[PDB]
Ligand SMILES: *[C@@H]1O[C@H](CO)[C@@H](O[C@@H]2O[C@H](CO)[C@@H](O[C@@H]3O[C@H](CO[C@H]4O[C@H](CO)[C@@H](O)[C@H](O[C@H]5O[C@H](CO)[C@@H](O)[C@H](O)[C@@H]5O)[C@@H]4O)[C@@H](O)[C@H](O[C@H]4O[C@H](CO)[C@@H](O)[C@H](O)[C@@H]4O[C@H]4O[C@H](CO)[C@@H](O)[C@H](O)[C@@H]4O[C@H]4O[C@H](CO)[C@@H](O)[C@H](O)[C@@H]4O)[C@@H]3O)[C@H](O)[C@H]2NC(C)=O)[C@H](O)[C@H]1NC(C)=O
Ligand SMILES: *[C@@H]1O[C@H](CO)[C@@H](O[C@@H]2O[C@H](CO)[C@@H](O[C@@H]3O[C@H](CO[C@H]4O[C@H](CO)[C@@H](O)[C@H](O)[C@@H]4O)[C@@H](O)[C@H](O[C@H]4O[C@H](CO)[C@@H](O)[C@H](O)[C@@H]4O[C@H]4O[C@H](CO)[C@@H](O)[C@H](O)[C@@H]4O)[C@@H]3O)[C@H](O)[C@H]2NC(C)=O)[C@H](O)[C@H]1NC(C)=O
């Protein structure tokens with residue numbers, strides 16, 4: 001087993017058995033504690049650098065939870081989608097991705113197209129909801 | 137293809153084919169940027185309006201996501217439900233709704249009962265879980 | 273028929289029928305209003321307690337929504353999982369659990385193990401999602 | 409039918425009228441001059457290089473000028489920024505004591521390039537000597553300074569003066585290295601709100617607009633402050649537009665918004681040198697040492713024919729709302745110096761121009777077209793240093809002199825009129841409009857009249873024939 | 881004589897009840913961020929580090 005980010009160097013297929021380790025630490029921190037001991041203690045130099053740390057944690061977490069909701073992957077860690085891979089984003093074979101690259105190397109390779117894959121994934125889920133409305 | 141609120145004047149039939157354009161923009165904003173250049177700049181007049189415009193953006197997103205969680209529609213754009221229309225809320229036909237109204241007029245006719253439709257929606261989802269715990 | 277926290281004294285069997293009553297009120301509050309009338313009103317002593325009351329409410333809601341996302345119980349009130357209670361956490365019979373125990377007493381006598389049930393419930397869902405990837 | 413079930417749609421295009429906390433976004437290309445502007449500070453977030461405006465087609469929305477909340481937020485922001493820019497730096501409490509002024513004697517150039525030939529700054533400034541304290545408390549020094557006659561009041565013992573603010577407040581010197589340049593400011597909404605903009609070119613204040621469009625935030629708005637004529641504005645599209653909350657209520661100001669600018673060209677030909685004394689520990693007070701070279705009153709020149717045609721068009725528009733009366737302009741009838749005279753700013757110097765040749769005339773019936781020759785109107789202007797911009801809410805300020813010659817080239821995109829009340833016994837078919845009037849808010853209603861802030865309600869409920877698959 | 885500072889500014893007196901003792905301070909990130917630390921002992925200023933933790 002590994003700690004937070006502990007499998008950052010392992011390959012894509014082997015570092016995917018530790019997704020829950022980096023997914024359990026997106027809101028949990030030390031910042032929620034009040035202080036060592038509690039004028040206007042909320043306007044101290046470190047009373048504002050802690051107020052904006054609480055807000056940064058919320059927006060960072062809600063930034064990906066918004067995409068999971070649109071794509072239909074709410075409440076799931078690994079989510080299968082009905083969007084075919086056109087291989088123009090990357091035409092590497094199965095064994096050259098899951099057994100040869102790294103999650104950092106892979107995400108830098110298709111960083112060009114992630115702005116478009118997000119649009120395709122969102123629109124594909126919308127088409128699924130239209131289909132079931134005129135089906136049930 | 138339309139932009140933000142671009143089909144607000146179109147009828148409910150044709151304004152419901154562009155729900156994703158008004159859904160991609162409930163958290164994304166310019167406010168996540170830092171500044172033109174980085175005393176106590178987190179207290180400037182322009183630096184307090186930017187703090188409360190980040191909390192407003194977060195809160196306005198959760199008050200619509202909170203309802204989706206209770207009704208069992210999390211992760212879905214169009215969500216069917218087992219709550220029957222009694223026509224006391226609105227006794228119009230199917231054609232007179234989806235071919236003769238825009239979304240703004242429709243939300244003004246049933247503005248009386250949305251406080252009650254929400255409670256009926258919540259109870260139905262709760263009754264789905266009780267009927268499923270004591271059945272499996 | 274009950275109010276907020278109205279079933280805190282009832283037995284667990286009869287206090288699980290009012291789950292929605294305590295669930296509708298994890299974001300809703302008086303704080304979201306602006307003021308009696310709109311110097312520097314945004315940094316009054318009570319203009320700061322309202323700012324930190326809004327953040328506390330948002331964070332409190334997101335501490336339970338974070339777990340439900342990992343456990344796979346997003347969009348549900350009573351979510352039935354696949355983790356077997358091994359009776360080491362509690363060996364009390366099914367009758368004694370739901371028929372003279374209250375929700376407060378139950379949480380206390382398993383309070384030693386909630387830190388371990390939470391990690392087990394996350395691992396079972398992750399193992400579910402891996403099994404579907406190499407099955408579909 | 410009997411097969412209708414509630415279906416939730418997420419993202420539907422609905423909104424409700426609401427009020428939010430607009431933040432500021434300004435372009436960084438104009439900034440990075442290290443000038444430390446007052447309004448459009450570096451704190452404003454960078455703007456989107458390609459803003460989006462979506463044409464909403466079939467929707468008519470009830471816009472309501474004179475009740476827009478966007479204006480009051482701008483007012484509070486302007487006041488707060490003005491106050492916080494004056495906070496850090498030097499006060500003027502040890503300065504104003506019993507002065508002693510005598511008529512100034514100057515050595516100067518003779519011809520002075522007498523093309524306008526308006527006047528000479530003598531009998532406007534006084535060369536007053538007074539005792540201040542140096543960096544050491546137990547040492548007083550006698551120093552001289554040139555003060556315009558509008559900054560000093562004459563107490564008893566007529567050969568002894570005092571500053572105009574001592575017995576009412578304490579003023580802080582305009583702070584030496586900041587700028588008063590109005591840099592455009594965009595007012596952007598949080599994520600969850602939108603701004604509806606009415607695109608009708610001939611659109612009065614309030615009413616249902618039929619050509620609404622949606623934006624994320626407004627165009628550039630300059631916080632320029634003026635009293636009688638709107639400066640550096642945005643031109644009307646269709647024609648001259650006359651807007652007022654109610655045209656039959658003379659207590660309500662009238663805003664005449666033009667569709668063709670009339671440039672006004674202002675200059676201070678004098679040569680003021682800036683000297684610095686020390687009134688305390690690390691506190692430096694700037695003053696005018698001498699006036700050497702050219703000596704002439706500051707003045708503003710205007711093309712006579714352009715302004716004359718502009719008044720013709722404004723009167724043509726005004727005759728429609730007042731059908732059977734002649735329209736006659738008259739100069740302001742009284743009030744403060746900020747009302748009776750067109751007040752504005754250049755490079756830190758605060759100008760008060762007379763503007764009485766622009767604003768009186770009569771238009772009886774347009775019986776015949778009268779042809780004249782090209783003329784240039786020369787408006788005399790005074791200059792003030794002790795500036796109380798906002799009567800009782802803004803901090804009083806002392807603007808230091810600016811070395812060199814001051815020259816501004818600005819546009820006149822609007823006029824602020826105020827109808828004179830009428831009587832019942834006898835109205836000789838005449839109406840007189842006098843310029844000025846209104847508060848500072850009317851300088852920003854002229855920009856924020858197109859915009860309304862709305863809150864998006866993306867949760868819709870409608871019946872459908874689909875039923876949720878109940879699990880067995 | 882005169883005080884050294886009497887032409888530049890005015891100095892508030894160091895204030896009796898406060899202490900100048902430096903207590904160690906830990907700079908911690910919010911949730912969603914992390915701090916990479918280069919464990920190489922013979923590490924100069926810039927460049928790649930090979931046992932980042
Ligand atoms: C690099 O690291 C080096 C190692 O850390 C560092 O050197 C260290 O520097 C610190 C500087 O703070 C030293 O700590 C001080 O040590 C003082 C020594 O006191 C001697 O004399 C006392 C008699 O006056 C003896 O009692 C004392 O013996 C006992 O002292 C302790 C009780 O005070 C006890 O716990 C010990 O176990 C020991 O048995 C010793 O022989 C010490 O006087 C001083 O105490 C202050 O700080 C304490 C907290 O650390 C407070 O608890 C204590 O009350 C003192 O605070 C007062 O003074 C502060 C400074 O003015 C104020 O802020 C406080 O509010 C408080 O002032 C109140 O009380 C006043 C009356 O006393 C009153 O007049 C005021 O108005 C106010 O009301 C402190 O502990 C440390 O000893 C150094 N290390 C070594 C090995 O010597 C070095 O500096 C570092 N390098 C650099 C560049 O910084
Ligand atoms: C209606 O709209 C018009 C058009 O925008 C507007 O006119 C313009 O006003 C601005 C603001 O005053 C003018 O900008 C200033 O112009 C002077 C003129 O300098 C001439 O000579 C220099 C050579 O020395 C030329 O390079 C220059 O182009 C001019 O021909 C400048 O001297 C001013 O410079 C200051 O601001 C710069 C901003 O980046 C600084 O970089 C520069 O160092 C100067 O700053 C100094 O003063 C600051 C305080 O003000 C201080 O903080 C600094 O430390 C430093 O000491 C400035 O560029 C512009 O020329 C006008 N344009 C025209 C065509 O007239 C009207 O003002 C407006 N109406 C109203 C009522 O506002």
Ligand SMILES: *[C@@H]1O[C@H](CO)[C@@H](O[C@@H]2O[C@H](CO)[C@@H](O)[C@H](O)[C@H]2NC(C)=O)[C@H](O)[C@H]1NC(C)=O
Nearest residue numbers: 001002005006007008009010011012013014015
């Ligand atoms: C870093 O790379 C080395 C070399 O590839 C990895 O070591 C191998 O790991 C696999 C995975 O189980 C073993 O089958 C091999 O026996 C290991 N040794 C060699 C020489 O290949 C190492 O696991 C990588 N680091 C991490 C954290 O996975």
Ligand SMILES: *[C@@H]1O[C@H](CO)[C@@H](O[C@@H]2O[C@H](CO)[C@@H](O)[C@H](O)[C@H]2NC(C)=O)[C@H](O)[C@H]1NC(C)=O
Nearest residue numbers: 274277278279280281282283284285286287374
């Ligand atoms: C509080 O406790 C009393 C027991 O003293 C509960 O009263 C019992 O309620 C059950 C179920 O309604 C009945 O079957 C018993 O006959 C009742 N006993 C008595 C003595 O009244 C009461 O319901 C509890 N209240 C709440 C809100 O849980």
Ligand SMILES: *[C@@H]1O[C@H](CO)[C@@H](O[C@@H]2O[C@H](CO)[C@@H](O)[C@H](O)[C@H]2NC(C)=O)[C@H](O)[C@H]1NC(C)=O
Nearest residue numbers: 283364365366367368369370371372373374377
């Ligand atoms: C029903 O609940 C009661 C109390 O909540 C349990 O009875 C208690 O038993 C303990 C001994 O273990 C006694 O000290 C208490 O005095 C009893 N309570 C009362 C009110 O007399 C009982 O065990 C529960 N039912 C079952 C089947 O266990």
Ligand SMILES: *[C@@H]1O[C@H](CO)[C@@H](O[C@@H]2O[C@H](CO)[C@@H](O)[C@H](O)[C@H]2NC(C)=O)[C@H](O)[C@H]1NC(C)=O
Nearest residue numbers: 463464465605606607608609618619620621645
């Ligand atoms: C709604 O407002 C838009 C604003 O762009 C109008 O578009 C302009 O209309 C004028 C008047 O004919 C044209 O001269 C311009 O070429 C149009 N485009 C632009 C960019 O200005 C539009 O006409 C208005 N009315 C309708 C029905 O759309």
Ligand SMILES: *[C@@H]1O[C@H](CO)[C@@H](O[C@@H]2O[C@H](CO)[C@@H](O)[C@H](O)[C@H]2NC(C)=O)[C@H](O)[C@H]1NC(C)=O
Nearest residue numbers: 644645646647648666667668720721722724725
């Ligand atoms: C500005 O608006 C005025 C309206 O007050 C326009 O004046 C009209 O111009 C047309 C030109 O075709 C004439 O036929 C009208 O008689 C004029 N009206 C009046 C009352 O004189 C003027 O053209 C507009 N200018 C611009 C540049 O838009």
Ligand SMILES: *[C@@H]1O[C@H](CO)[C@@H](O[C@@H]2O[C@H](CO)[C@@H](O)[C@H](O)[C@H]2NC(C)=O)[C@H](O)[C@H]1NC(C)=O
Nearest residue numbers: 521523671672673674675677709815816817818
């Ligand atoms: C604004 O005023 C300045 C000076 O008052 C103008 O510059 C002068 O214009 C006159 C016009 O006949 C020329 O003769 C001079 O040679 C110009 N320069 C100087 C130094 O006097 C300037 O042109 C005016 N701007 C506008 C737009 O009218």
Ligand SMILES: *[C@@H]1O[C@H](CO)[C@@H](O[C@@H]2O[C@H](CO)[C@@H](O)[C@H](O)[C@H]2NC(C)=O)[C@H](O)[C@H]1NC(C)=O
Nearest residue numbers: 511512513514535536537552553554697698699
């Ligand atoms: C304002 O008055 C003072 C004193 O009355 C003038 O200061 C003197 O001016 C004369 C001019 O001939 C100089 O010779 C002296 O050296 C100056 N100082 C003193 C202490 O006498 C000052 O020049 C006057 N200012 C103006 C603009 O006339």
Ligand SMILES: *[C@@H]1O[C@H](CO)[C@@H](O[C@@H]2O[C@H](CO)[C@@H](O)[C@H](O)[C@H]2NC(C)=O)[C@H](O)[C@H]1NC(C)=O
Nearest residue numbers: 710711712713714715716717718781782783784
């Ligand atoms: C003041 O404005 C008038 C316009 O009313 C200008 O007169 C025009 O000048 C241009 C260029 O010299 C000619 O082509 C026009 O025929 C003139 N008349 C009209 C009615 O446009 C005059 O030039 C302006 N004054 C200055 C100094 O520029």
Ligand SMILES: *[C@@H]1O[C@H](CO)[C@@H](O[C@@H]2O[C@H](CO)[C@@H](O)[C@H](O)[C@H]2NC(C)=O)[C@H](O)[C@H]1NC(C)=O
Nearest residue numbers: 739740744745747748749761762763764765788
């Ligand atoms: C602006 O200038 C006009 C003159 O162009 C001033 O009007 C004169 O005011 C004096 C003051 O009592 C009268 O005696 C004159 O009869 C007025 N008319 C003329 C033609 O001189 C006017 O006062 C000036 N504005 C201000 C605020 O003083």
Ligand SMILES: *[C@@H]1O[C@H](CO)[C@@H](O[C@@H]2O[C@H](CO)[C@@H](O)[C@H](O)[C@H]2NC(C)=O)[C@H](O)[C@H]1NC(C)=O
Nearest residue numbers: 640641642643667668669670671817818819820
């Ligand atoms: C003053 O007004 C003139 C004319 O109205 C402006 O000159 C034009 O401004 C527009 C802005 O929409 C530009 O697109 C043009 O390129 C400018 N020149 C011409 C010949 O049309 C001038 O910009 C205005 N001054 C200020 C400071 O706004």
Ligand SMILES: *[C@@H]1O[C@H](CO)[C@@H](O[C@@H]2O[C@H](CO)[C@@H](O)[C@H](O)[C@H]2NC(C)=O)[C@H](O)[C@H]1NC(C)=O
Nearest residue numbers: 917918919920921922923928929930931932933
């Ligand atoms: C990277 O740094 C780590 C530091 O934890 C090294 O691991 C330690 O190295 C030291 C010195 O060689 C040993 O004394 C320790 O026993 C090692 N382990 C621990 C837990 O401290 C690691 O060796 C470094 N990387 C490489 C490739 O040597």
Ligand SMILES: *[C@@H]1O[C@H](CO)[C@@H](O)[C@H](O)[C@H]1NC(C)=O
Nearest residue numbers: 083084085086087088089120
């Ligand atoms: C792959 O890319 C091509 C062109 O970029 C596009 O036509 C195709 O739709 C893409 N694949 C999918 C599944 O959209």
Ligand SMILES: *[C@@H]1O[C@H](CO)[C@@H](O)[C@H](O)[C@H]1NC(C)=O
Nearest residue numbers: 086087088089090091092093
């Ligand atoms: C994958 O794409 C690259 C770039 O277009 C191309 O050079 C390569 O031949 C492709 N691989 C295959 C197997 O077609």
Ligand SMILES: *[C@@H]1O[C@H](CO)[C@@H](O)[C@H](O)[C@H]1NC(C)=O
Nearest residue numbers: 220221222223224225249252
């Ligand atoms: C329709 O609304 C009325 C309003 O009181 C309610 O009583 C009724 O139960 C609703 N219809 C159904 C089928 O429940």
Ligand SMILES: *[C@@H]1O[C@H](CO)[C@@H](O)[C@H](O)[C@H]1NC(C)=O
Nearest residue numbers: 357358359360361385388389
């Ligand atoms: C039962 O759960 C407890 C939790 O502490 C654990 O210690 C024990 O090993 C578990 N037993 C089995 C058989 O999993």
Ligand SMILES: *[C@@H]1O[C@H](CO)[C@@H](O)[C@H](O)[C@H]1NC(C)=O
Nearest residue numbers: 514516527528529530531703
């Ligand atoms: C100063 O102004 C007066 C007022 O008309 C004028 O007579 C005189 O020539 C001007 N110049 C001097 C040096 O007095």
